[PDB]
């Protein structure tokens, strides 16, 4: 169901025969970059984000997007989270932090077409939703060859919520 540990550093989603793909990771001890979709410099054009591992009290800033004057580029947090940058479309640069509770926790990567990919995330508590659901939040991207993961990761191509909380 769910597989890995995997140490590579480029994940292949073209041949990839399925709806949904899930991407986790052992909760880490320090904030530390996870996976990253866009081009090897910041460029305004072409849509890109980049997910992070927030310790409890530390302040996540974005590699991707350290020479920027937006100031969603850094953010504190209070607990244990995933935070992702991004921009897309009219978005310049946004965040979105979420908590991470779970001792294992990731992203779900929707194939919704061949042209383009949702990414999907979620609060991992076992008390922040009645009905637990990995399309929370959701934003759509443009879908790509290839994506870039920087830390040691497992894949499920099936819901893995019940083995994860």
Same mark, same amino acid.
């Given at each position: 169901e769910?597989?890995?540990?995997?140490?590579n550093?480029?994940?292949?989603?073209?041949?990839?025969?399925?709806?949904?793909?899930?991407? %986790?990771?052992?909760?880490?001890?320090?904030?530390?970059?996870? #996976?990253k /979709?866009?081009?090897?410099?910041? =460029? &305004? $054009?072409?849509?890109?984000?980049?997910?992070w591992?927030?310790?409890?009290?530390?302040?996540?800033?974005s590699?991707?997007?350290?020479?920027?004057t937006?100031?969603?580029?850094?953010?504190?947090?209070?607990?244990?989270? %995933?935070?992702?940058?991004?921009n897309?479309?009219?978005?310049? #640069?946004? /965040?979105?932090?979420?908590?991470? =509770? &779970? $001792?294992?926790?990731?992203?779900?990567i929707?194939?919704?077409?061949?042209?383009?990919?949702?990414?999907?995330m979620a609060?991992?508590?076992?008390?922040?939703?009645?009905?637990?659901?990995?399309?929370?939040?959701?934003?759509?991207?443009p879908?790509?060859?290839s994506?870039?993961?920087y830390?040691?990761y497992?894949?499920?191509?099936?819901?893995?919520y019940?083995?994860?909380?």
């Open positions: 769910i597989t890995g540990p995997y140490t550093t480029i994940i292949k989603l073209s041949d990839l025969s399925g709806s949904n793909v899930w991407v %986790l990771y052992q909760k880490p001890t320090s904030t530390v970059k996870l #996976l /979709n866009g081009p090897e410099s910041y =460029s &305004w $054009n072409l849509a890109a984000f980049e997910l591992y927030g310790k409890a009290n530390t302040t996540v800033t590699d991707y997007y350290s020479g920027m937006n100031s969603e580029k850094s953010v504190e947090v209070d607990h244990d989270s %995933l935070v992702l940058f991004w897309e479309g009219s978005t310049a #640069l946004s /965040n979105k932090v979420i908590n991470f =509770s &779970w $001792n294992v926790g990731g992203v779900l929707k194939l919704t077409s061949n042209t383009r990919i949702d990414v999907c609060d991992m508590d076992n008390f922040t939703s009645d009905s637990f659901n990995w399309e929370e939040w959701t934003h759509n991207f879908r790509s060859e994506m870039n993961i830390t040691d497992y894949l499920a191509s099936v819901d893995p019940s083995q994860i909380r």
